[PDB]
């Protein structure tokens, strides 16, 4: 019966550790301490933004390094112009819960959701002038926590469903699900060619699914707690991630395997943003408490303590050319930094 | 040109601030709490005007379990509508515990939590047709006049419990009660005056 | 998304009247509106300009202190009062609407516009050609020069070009150098360092004839260049 179900189970399991030793080795910290370490930088900020009114939750940056997004549980998006600091346009959301937003890599389209478990998707270049909703994604049973443009038409979006989606936004119904997570999934991230997306979810587990495909790939389970952020290396072959637990962990998908972890005994608050440089060798992570510290990538030096945010960072991002990252806290502020 | 681009976020800064003077006094409200309590007898959202102040209540309950993922984004709320049903036994005790995963958990330790219990007219109707056995009915709260003492004892045990298991500091503080109402929207206005009260107090040092 | 204007006729010089447009399909109060003269047989000129919210109006120093401009948001008309009227005033009058943000179109639309008859040191900038015979099925190309820079400092120019049909509200090919507008073939482009401008349409169509104009918005004081038309 049932009883010679799971012996293969953990047989497998027990596989799969041994072949990930085996393939192991001696660390890479023999190997990056070689070169000069970069060092504690000094970074300031260059446009204390000032404008929004309640929490904000996430935020992205289009394909070009000078346009925003930001949602916040005030029921409104507002489109940021970073070089003059001047308001774009402002979305009027119907529902004031809202946790993620996007930018369409076309710059035509804005998606953002919450606990309406529904996505809203705006059009931002309409004959008309005003923003106004182009469809909205049903179908969800649990709160959607994030989503990322594929691309000008194929969209995918994480839920509290313990799954994620794949939508079309010419026809509106649900192309593939990735029912593979056994835990609440809050963190997706996409590789820059657009083929491959991790997911970490709630039972510190991070997978990598396939577009078309649909069934997961590859997991890694050296986590503690839930995973609230991830994010790909620039090169796609690995990505980074952190959770509650105050520690960030980085995963390669051709090792299969951890690779090397982020953190300090003077910090216990957990990381709720990842995200790399455009050469991936600073790591920028957030932390719920006042300050925002930056993690070497390969040394896990302490780069930057940069601070200024008078509440926890919740989101956090970084120009697709490099020139300047951009953060925001719950006390409706948002910082460049360059 | 940019002047006019300066024109229009000077407009939508205005339009920002117009509706958000309107959301200063929402005085929103979060209700949750078990099933087979009486949601309906007080995401929904309900519509109700006491004393020329408006309410704001938050029925959720499209989400599926545990609670402590998406309850962070209710940081900022006034005050915590809590209800169970006092007239079961067997699903009193995680419950109880369900109690414990609010009061204690983080981003949640600065709202109080309004207890709201309802079937005291069933318990009562029960009792008429391990703790427990040792208690006695404390003299401060005095019950009203030509009530059966019998269900208040219980009811004492269970709000002794209750105390017992919220107190287990004071920048928040709860505020055990029962209900059977009209006066329903006066007792929530009340409640939440009592705790601006007091949260007032929190930043003038006093 | 149409405009349609009123009025009009026949006015006795020095009459005062009233000009009212009226807009629907679009947002009204997002958008900010132009008026922009046609004399017959000669170039567009601007005459008025009112902003979003009517916080900002200008003038052209011709008309400064002469004419006045007013917006109605809850019925969507747009107010324009004629005080004085002379023989240079009679022309044609056409209502734009325009808004200005990072990745905008302004003068993306042309009203159809009325009829009207009757019984200094500023920018300026003039094309050398005024009308060339070239057949379709090969590029035309044809140059502007600006008397002073539109490149400013911020990093992109401000010339316009327009599309006049014959008997037709005019309309908008390319509103900045490198980025197409709306609604037009990807025939059309320009490009220039400052000083000449040039445009360069790849084939030649018998619906692309017309009268091209040139326009600059890096100051308010609007000129518009001399019509270039071209015939097969």
């Known amino acids: 019966e049932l009883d010679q179900l799971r012996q293969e189970a953990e047989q497998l399991k027990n596989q799969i550790r041994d072949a990930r030793k085996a393939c192991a080795d001696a660390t890479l910290s023999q190997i990056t301490n070689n070169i000069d370490p970069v060092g504690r930088i000094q970074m300031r900020t260059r446009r204390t933004l000032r404008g929004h009114l309640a929490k904000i939750y996430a935020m992205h940056w289009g394909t070009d390094s000078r346009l925003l997004v930001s949602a916040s549980q005030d029921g409104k998006l507002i489109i940021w112009d970073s070089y003059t600091t001047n308001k774009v346009h402002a979305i009027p959301l119907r529902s004031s819960w809202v946790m993620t937003c996007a930018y369409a890599p076309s710059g035509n389209y804005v998606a953002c959701g919450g606990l309406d478990n529904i996505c809203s998707i705006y059009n931002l270049k309409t004959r008309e002038g005003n923003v106004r909703v182009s469809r909205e994604l049903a179908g969800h049973t649990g709160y959607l926590s994030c989503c990322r443009f594929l691309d000008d038409n194929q969209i995918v979006t994480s839920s509290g469903d313990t799954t994620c989606a794949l939508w079309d936004i010419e026809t509106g119904q649900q192309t593939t699900t990735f029912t593979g997570h056994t835990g609440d999934v809050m963190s997706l991230s996409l590789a820059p060619d657009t083929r491959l997306f991790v997911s970490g979810a709630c039972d510190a587990s991070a997978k990598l699914w396939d577009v078309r495909e649909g069934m997961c790939r590859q997991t890694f389970t050296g986590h503690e707690s839930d995973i609230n952020a991830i994010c790909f290396f620039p090169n796609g072959n690995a990505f980074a991630t952190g959770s509650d637990d105050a520690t960030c962990r980085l995963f390669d998908l051709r090792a299969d395997q951890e690779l090397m972890t982020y953190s300090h005994d003077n910090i216990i608050c957990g990381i709720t943003s990842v995200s790399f440089s455009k050469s991936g060798r600073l790591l920028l992570a957030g932390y719920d408490d006042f300050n925002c510290n930056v993690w070497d990538a390969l040394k896990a030096d302490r780069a930057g303590v940069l601070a200024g945010h008078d509440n926890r960072v919740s989101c956090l991002g970084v120009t697709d050319d490099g020139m300047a990252v951009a953060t925001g806290s719950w006390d409706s502020f948002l910082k460049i930094w360059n | 040109e940019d002047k006019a681009a300066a024109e229009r976020s000077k407009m939508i800064d205005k339009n920002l601030r117009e509706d958000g003077e309107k959301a200063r006094r929402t005085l929103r409200l979060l209700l949750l709490g078990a099933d087979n309590s009486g949601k309906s007898t007080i995401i929904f959202e309900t519509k109700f005007q006491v004393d020329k102040v408006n309410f704001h209540m938050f029925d959720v309950g499209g989400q599926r379990d545990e609670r402590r993922k998406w309850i962070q984004c209710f940081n900022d709320v006034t005050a915590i509508i809590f209800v169970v049903d006092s007239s079961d036994y067997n699903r009193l005790q995680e419950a109880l515990n369900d109690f414990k995963s609010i009061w204690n958990n983080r981003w949640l330790r600065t709202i109080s939590v309004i207890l709201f219990l309802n079937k005291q007219d069933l318990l009562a109707e029960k009792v008429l047709a391990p703790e427990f056995a040792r208690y006695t009915t404390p003299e401060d709260a005095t019950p009203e006049p030509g009530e059966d003492p019998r269900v208040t004892r219980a009811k004492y045990f269970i709000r002794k419990e209750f105390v017992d298991i919220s107190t287990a500091d004071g920048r928040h503080i709860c505020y055990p009660h029962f209900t059977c109402d009209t006066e329903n929207a006066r007792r929530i206005f009340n409640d939440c005056k009592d705790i601006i009260l007091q949260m007032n107090l929190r930043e003038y040092n006093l | 998304v149409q405009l349609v204007e009123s009025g009009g006729g026949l006015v006795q010089p020095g009459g005062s009247r009233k000009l009212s447009c009226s807009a629907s399909g679009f947002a009204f109060s997002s958008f900010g509106m132009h008026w922009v003269r046609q004399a017959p047989e000669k170039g567009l000129e601007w005459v008025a300009y009112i902003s979003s919210g009517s916080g900002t109006i200008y003038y052209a120093d011709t008309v400064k202190g002469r004419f006045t401009i007013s917006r109605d948001d809850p019925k969507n008309t747009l107010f324009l009062q004629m005080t004085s009227l002379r023989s240079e005033d009679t022309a044609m009058y056409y209502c734009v609407r325009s808004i200005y943000y990072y990745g905008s179109s302004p003068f993306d639309f042309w009203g159809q516009g009325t009829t009207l008859t009757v019984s200094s040191a500023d920018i300026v900038m003039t094309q050398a050609t005024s009308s060339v015979p070239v057949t379709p099925g090969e590029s035309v190309s044809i140059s502007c020069r600006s008397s002073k820079s539109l490149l400013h400092s911020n990093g992109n120019t401000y010339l316009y070009w327009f599309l006049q049909r014959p008997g037709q509200s005019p309309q908008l090919l390319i509103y900045?150098?490198?980025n197409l507008a709306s609604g037009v073939p990807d025939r059309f482009s320009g490009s220039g360092s400052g000083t000449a401008f040039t445009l360069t349409i790849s084939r030649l169509e018998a619906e692309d004839v017309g009268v091209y104009y040139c326009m600059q918005h890096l100051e308010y004081p609007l000129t518009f260049g001399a019509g270039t038309k071209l015939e097969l």
């Open positions: 900045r150098m490198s």
